Amino acid sequence: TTIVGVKFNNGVVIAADTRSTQGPIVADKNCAKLHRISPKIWCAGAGTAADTEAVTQLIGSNIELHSLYTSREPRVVSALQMLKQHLFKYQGHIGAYLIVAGVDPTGSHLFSIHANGSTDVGYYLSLGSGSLAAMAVLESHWKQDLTKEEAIKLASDAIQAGIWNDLGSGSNVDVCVMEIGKDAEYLRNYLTPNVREEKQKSYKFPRGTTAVLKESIVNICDIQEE
């Protein structure tokens, strides 16, 4: 997994690859790692996939209820505080490593979160097995006062570094841009640099190739009238 977060002029961008693995096997080639906590607070997760999804939804649910209770749009610091206290209580056993980004009435924010509850602040961050490959690109091309176009470019370039160089990462680049005073734009499959080539042969079988013992209609309908 490679995930990054990059601050820019009027907001923040996060990105991620789309490969999920079971040991050395690729379980899903087009996985969605960008999760929504609230409309304008999104996070990307590395580590145990069920944990990152579950902890995001629990805090996302509680954030929504909090937003309704207070009649205020949710804040990133609230999502951060709730995530870290939950993760600290479980002493690292919930394996969720997150980059949390968003815009709120206070401004634009970028944080990261380690599974044991430690948080940090930054202008550019990376997490996952491909974080070193990504951070190399970020440390080489990051500057202060990036534009929206420059930040999207830098973020996707950092994910590409993970895709090509880290065996734990691959396939496509997903991006989400959160700008102040605008709707967050989720760009699913922003880059697609790994389409499989046409195969040499068709493997469609002639009908009747498989040996069959018994056939029967399965009743999926409910008990009928009359």
């Binding site: 999920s20 079971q22 096997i25 379980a27 899903d28 087009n30 996985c31 145990t48 996939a49 069920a50 944990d51 999804e53 579950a54 056993h93 919930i94 195969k199 068709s202 493997y203 469609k204 079988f205 002639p206 009908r207 190739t209 498989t210 040996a211 069959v212 013992l213 018994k214 056939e215 029967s216 209609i217 399965v218 999926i220």
Partner: protein, 204 residues
């Protein structure tokens, strides 16, 4: 010792043109000893189908649990549960046992009754959802199944062509796994007809 490979078995699911297919082997064993050749791993709740691999006691328990929950769902909602909704229920139910999990590999398959859209999904033992467009695999020969499906599969196959593809994917994968085989079943699922076919295969 490893709970997920004591009993053995496999499940595979695929999508086609206006149809889905789900298939499984029939073996239950105690490690090397073959115990049963009639242990079906695919169940259905209305028009939603669920395959489960892994520890057999948990397979039986979870079937009974989801029958329980989908029956209460239907009574309260006054309609059958859909594949997309059921997928979330499986995920929720597995994660509630985060630190004492059911040792299983579930697979959901079905067609949404309102949109007509074919749907498949897979899970790890702890609830993480894999929603693939093409195919889902599970069990002690999942590596073998990934190899078969990746080469044999093409999109928009007609029901009777999809049957041949998924059948050959299962059969040849099972024959390269010691703990899978001893018979096989394939379900072909259309919007308002489902056909069930038992396959002839080697019994070693």
């Amino acid at each position: 010792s490893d709970p997920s490979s004591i009993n053995g078995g496999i499940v595979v699911a695929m999508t086609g043109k206006d149809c889905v297919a789900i298939a499984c082997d029939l073996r239950l064993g105690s490690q090397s000893l073959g115990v049963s050749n009639k242990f079906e791993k695919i169940f259905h709740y209305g028009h939603v189908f669920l395959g489960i691999t892994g520890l057999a006691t948990d397979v039986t328990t979870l079937n009974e649990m989801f029958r329980y929950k989908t029956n209460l769902y239907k009574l309260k909602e006054e309609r059958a549960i859909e594949p997309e909704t059921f997928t979330q229920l499986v995920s929720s139910s597995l994660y509630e046992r985060r630190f004492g999990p059911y040792f299983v590999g579930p697979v959901v398959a079905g067609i949404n009754s309102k949109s007509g859209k074919p749907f498949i999904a897979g899970f790890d033992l702890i609830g993480c959802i894999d929603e693939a467009k093409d195919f889902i695999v599970s069990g002690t020969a999942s590596d073998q199944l990934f190899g078969m499906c990746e080469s044999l599969y093409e999109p928009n196959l007609e029901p009777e062509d999809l049957f041949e593809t998924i059948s050959q994917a299962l059969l040849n994968a099972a024959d390269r796994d010691a703990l899978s085989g001893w018979g096989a079943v394939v379900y072909i699922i259309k919007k308002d007809e489902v056909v069930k076919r038992y396959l002839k295969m080697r019994q070693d």
